[PDB]
């Protein structure tokens, strides 16, 4: 029981007061993209970054004259040396096109 | 309580809670190799028996 043209005067007062968009005609202004908050930085941190390892453990205490073997890497090298022993190593990397 | 889960923790932002299972592997590796530190044969003047 109140004119619509009269209610807009109140709706417009709130917009001027609270600083909101006054769009009585429902025009597509793309403002829904402006209100949507970014989500890039939340997704970029998904995979943990490379951090301290045994190499940084050896370099930290290496100044004091302390050593420690890398059972993972020392085993990898031991395996490669075994292959080359029985003629099973990798071929020579080719650096040119096949021709 | 510390004997039910390896990480006794609660946080309101779970970003500090999802990587713990992976870190446990990395931390345990550091501790294992940390306690295996040994002097270099040249520091103690020990003659290394290479083999």
């Amino acid at each position: 029981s109140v004119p619509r043209a009269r209610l807009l005067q109140l709706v417009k007062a709130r917009c001027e007061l609270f600083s909101t968009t006054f769009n009585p005609e429902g025009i597509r202004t793309g403002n829904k993209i402006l209100r949507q908050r970014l989500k890039g930085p939340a997704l970029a941190t998904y995979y943990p970054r490379k951090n301290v390892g045994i190499r940084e453990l050896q370099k930290e205490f290496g100044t004091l004259g302390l050593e420690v073997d890398d059972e993972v890497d020392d085993d990898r090298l031991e395996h490669l040396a075994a292959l080359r022993a029985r003629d099973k190593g990798a071929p020579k990397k080719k650096r040119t096109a096949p021709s | 309580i510390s004997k039910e889960w390896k990480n006794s923790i609660y946080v309101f932002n779970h970003n500090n809670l999802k990587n713990l299972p992976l870190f446990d592997i990395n931390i345990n590796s550091l501790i294992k190799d940390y306690f295996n530190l040994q002097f270099k044969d040249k520091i103690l003047f020990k003659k290394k028996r290479l083999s």
């Binding site: 080359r84 | 044969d41 040249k42 003047f45 290394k48 290479l50």
Partner: peptide, 14 residues
């Protein structure tokens, strides 16, 4: 470089 060889030069003189 290449196939690694053992670092035989490791000793401390008295």
């Amino acid at each position: 470089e290449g196939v690694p060889v053992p670092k035989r030069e490791d000793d401390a003189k008295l």
